Amino acid sequence: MDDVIDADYKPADGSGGSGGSGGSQDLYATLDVPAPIAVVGGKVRAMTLEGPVEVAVPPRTQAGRKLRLKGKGFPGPAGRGDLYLEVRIT
């Protein structure tokens, strides 16, 4: 089932590594996405423990949406965790 709509990002000068050490594979964070960038579906820079990252916003996004960046959370050698972003239209 499509719970969260499928989302992705890229580390904008962010610094990962071969993790899998645990800590918190998943991270919970809140996303400032401007109203024009929500409707068109562009990218917005989210703050994480790894640093600044540019997250692909889906075309025609509403406030109160939820994103789960699967295999894109905390570092891991065979696969990464998830990054759960709560969409807020700015």
Curated annotation (Swiss-Prot):
It comes from Thermus thermophilus (strain ATCC 27634 / DSM 579 / HB8). The gene is dnaJ2. This is Chaperone protein DnaJ 2. It is found in: Cytoplasm. Belongs to the DnaJ family. Forms a heterononamer with DnaJ and DafA in the resting state. Three copies of each protein are present in the complex. Does not influence ATP binding or hydrolysis nor ADP release. Exerts influence on the interaction of DnaK with substrates; in the presence of DafA, DnaJ inhibits substrate binding, and substrate already bound to DnaK is displaced by DnaJ and DafA.
